[PDB]
Symmetry: C5
Subunit: 209 residues, 5 copies
């Protein structure tokens, strides 16, 4: 409940309870079903676009949510959420398939845990990608796709789930402007292994101002 | 007179470490942590009017209280330095940063016997902001918003310090740029999707090429 | 058992067992024989090519597998595989002998351990190499060779062998890159130095590529 | 007795028993006297456009902690110690615009009388006055260094040479003079001062006269 | 018996029980003798204006700690050991102008007779004499390597080839000769000397066009 959110001892006790119960290295599968992970990229900036190399340098807020109901507690007289270092938590092992630089995390590495077991982790990331930059100087713009999913968990273990112009988020001072952002679910079988991986394809349709 | 009593200092640090919860916000009573922050600009290193990006160095003055850390300093040190890893510090971020904050200074805070904490890292960082007009007489106005990344307004308030007349007092005379005005104001951020508001300080840096 | 994959307590128990048994700093030699490590590079991108200095910056999936039967478990009624942080496991001490930067790991540092004891570690790596870049802007392209093997274990301790599947070597290469891969070979190779009797078994990867024409 | 290995291990143990790495080693209720001397080795880059220099210096840093002393009548006079086992002064350069990059093993020497010597080779960029670098009298780039969080009552930081024994002969530049002077700074708001050292690096480009 | 896994695990346990990673392994109150041999792999960038070079080399580093030795009559002769479990010499290059970037797994070999071999591949930049690089006789770039904090009484650092087994075919440069000569450095202010190896890299631009 709101009134108790700022009760420090309660917050300390919740963090203790979460660290007691959390298994940071085991997927939080419940009821023999895959962990349902939702990913939403809020684009903040498009910093460099190279039409010769088909590369983009971007900043996005990666809103990542899933549940671990073993973390839940009765918050009828305690805080409903706390901030938790992600090192204390399991986090989905997401990777961007067409990323060509390491992800630069620009923000404090803390997640929110809600008393119903919901977890929210939303880092600001700067990262470079190989994608189709063709058309960026035209009115219809370019469409750059970013493909994200679990790097080591197949669809039986983790599933990823997905039409905005990101007006609340995207920098008005970018040389570029966003026309549309859409996400589509993807299921892929790769050469290495017989089971499929789920991914989200995020399509960033943008153009130079 | 007691500042240099080493055993006293050791005991204060012991006490602080016994009491400190580095991962828990220090909400006293049932009120949000009152965090004060002010950027004292030290340098403007690179500016790009085409890309609207700036590279700057600033003192990030950060202060708050945790009364549980207070001690009787009648016959002991009034202040000690403490590694920030031993303390809770606010999870501040700049919303329009496009690089990680590069901390240039030792990551030590000062804890005062009344429980006041002062952390002031010197930081180099790059931002996306309005660089238009930087070569004109009236200059460009680049705004930086700084707030708690994961704590909403009910948990942490991030407000300007009481002093902002000194925001460019420590600015390098050897910069290619000169600062015309700095304001630092309360600002609240909300998103249509969700109930949380985030309290930040909006810093408006008005500057121009010399 | 694939039906038991989402049994969380089972996964946690398997992880516990692996960590009790694993010796992260000791080679998993079985039967006084060398550890057979398989390595195959699947190329994803070529980021920079410097004709002046003969250097290339590349992104590749480093497919790495080996066995440690001591990690094996009965999976008749439990998960067939789990993900494990590589810090809990022995991993081969591989290095590229002509690399001129650190390998930059772009993906989560987790391996897969299979119930028969096989381990699969496949990081995406961005790394720079010194190699032959002449010909890149011609029809027949440039050929850059990368040699990968154990840095400290000679052939008596570790054998580093290629896989025989190469059809996917450029299958995940970016369609948007300025470059295109013409051919890839991955072959067994052995290096010895005149000073000493040790041989080092490695995989030699030959990457034939060119700049796409207008 | 220097190479008596067991003696060295015992000294390291004794130091780690008594060392308080996060507490200033104030003795007899006086400030810690910290000596600093920058021995410049290389001037890597000078940007006349931006007033920036990129340099390498050896940061000779000394102070005492008598609690670390031992009787060395029949034991080693000195050992090397990882600085993570020691208190070290929280020095910062006020006009640094990059992180200090330490190029050398992060070990200090501890002497049996309790003297500590820490001398990293540091590469770091500074904002300073580079005008005149192409003239006969050269540029003078001043670097201000002191304790970032300790006032003069807690730490005092204290310091003429042309650095000929240290500066690279192969540098593009040559050093005319390096001066290092005591500097006390009090901020208007508050009563307590910081003790700093002002290092003045007077240098110039070799072969200033060119054919254009 | 090399591949007996339990044997290797027991050897690593024994090494970790006896190893003092922070204490120099002096035997018989004599200095630790460290051998260093740089195998040059590549010369990546050279600048004759600033006298800087960017190179890659394998740093073959060897020394003994007999306390680590074991009877290998019926056990492995050698094992790989993370260097964090071992004392390693605190070597530094005096004229380095960037930090040593270690490109390889940080593992050493320990031999059952107590011999230790650590050989990182290192990329690093140096200030040295690059003059003559575009001539037949070439430039000679000297790199001075020694213990950073141990003087000659504590550590001794001791060492002709063209490195044709190691040097990259694809360098824009070629090696004429690499020599390594024992050297010793002393400074006027202080008594002790530092032993170092002086590595003389004689090299030149490959396949250069000449005026004849
Ligand atoms: C989250 C925001 C917006 C303000 C910045 N921090 C956060 C945040 C909140 C919680 C955890 N991590 C970061 C948002 C979520 C949806 C729209 S915005
Ligand atoms: C590996 C893939 C493809 C799908 C993404 N994850 C994996 C994976 C599987 C196991 C461990 N680490 C990553 C491949 C490697 C080579 C061709 S496919
Ligand atoms: C060592 C080599 C050559 C193969 C690469 N690794 C090693 C190695 C071997 C052991 C430890 N660290 C690296 C050599 C030594 C002399 C000539 S070669
Ligand atoms: C603080 C200064 C000025 C001198 C440098 N360090 C500090 C400092 C002090 C405390 C903690 N962290 C850094 C100032 C505050 C107001 C005017 S100046
Ligand atoms: C110290 C030197 C010379 C260069 C080698 N190492 C050291 C060193 C010695 C001890 C600790 N840290 C570094 C000097 C001091 C004064 C003139 S020279």
């Amino acid at each position: 409940d709101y009134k108790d959110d700022d009760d420090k001892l309660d917050r300390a006790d919740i963090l203790y309870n979460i660290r007691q119960t959390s298994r940071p290295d085991v997927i939080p599968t419940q009821r023999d079903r895959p962990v349902a992970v939702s990913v939403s990229l809020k684009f903040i900036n498009i910093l460099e676009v190279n039409e010769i190399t088909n590369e983009v340098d971007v900043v996005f807020w990666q809103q990542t949510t899933w549940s671990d109901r073993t973390l839940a507690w009765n918050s009828s007289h305690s805080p409903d959420q706390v901030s938790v270092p992600i090192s204390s938590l399991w986090v989905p092992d997401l990777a961007a398939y067409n990323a060509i630089s390491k992800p630069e995390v620009l923000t404090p590495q803390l997640a929110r845990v809600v008393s119903d077991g919901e977890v929210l982790y939303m880092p600001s990331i700067r990262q470079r990608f190989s994608c189709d930059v063709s058309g960026v100087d035209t009115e219809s713009g370019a469409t750059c796709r970013i493909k994200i999913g679990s790097w080591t968990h197949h669809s039986r273990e983790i599933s990823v789930d997905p039409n905005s112009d990101d007006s609340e988020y995207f920098s008005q001072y970018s040389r570029f402007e966003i026309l549309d952002v859409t996400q589509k679910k993807n299921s892929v079988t790769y050469s290495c292994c017989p089971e499929a991986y789920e991914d989200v394809e995020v399509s960033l349709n943008f153009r130079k101002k």
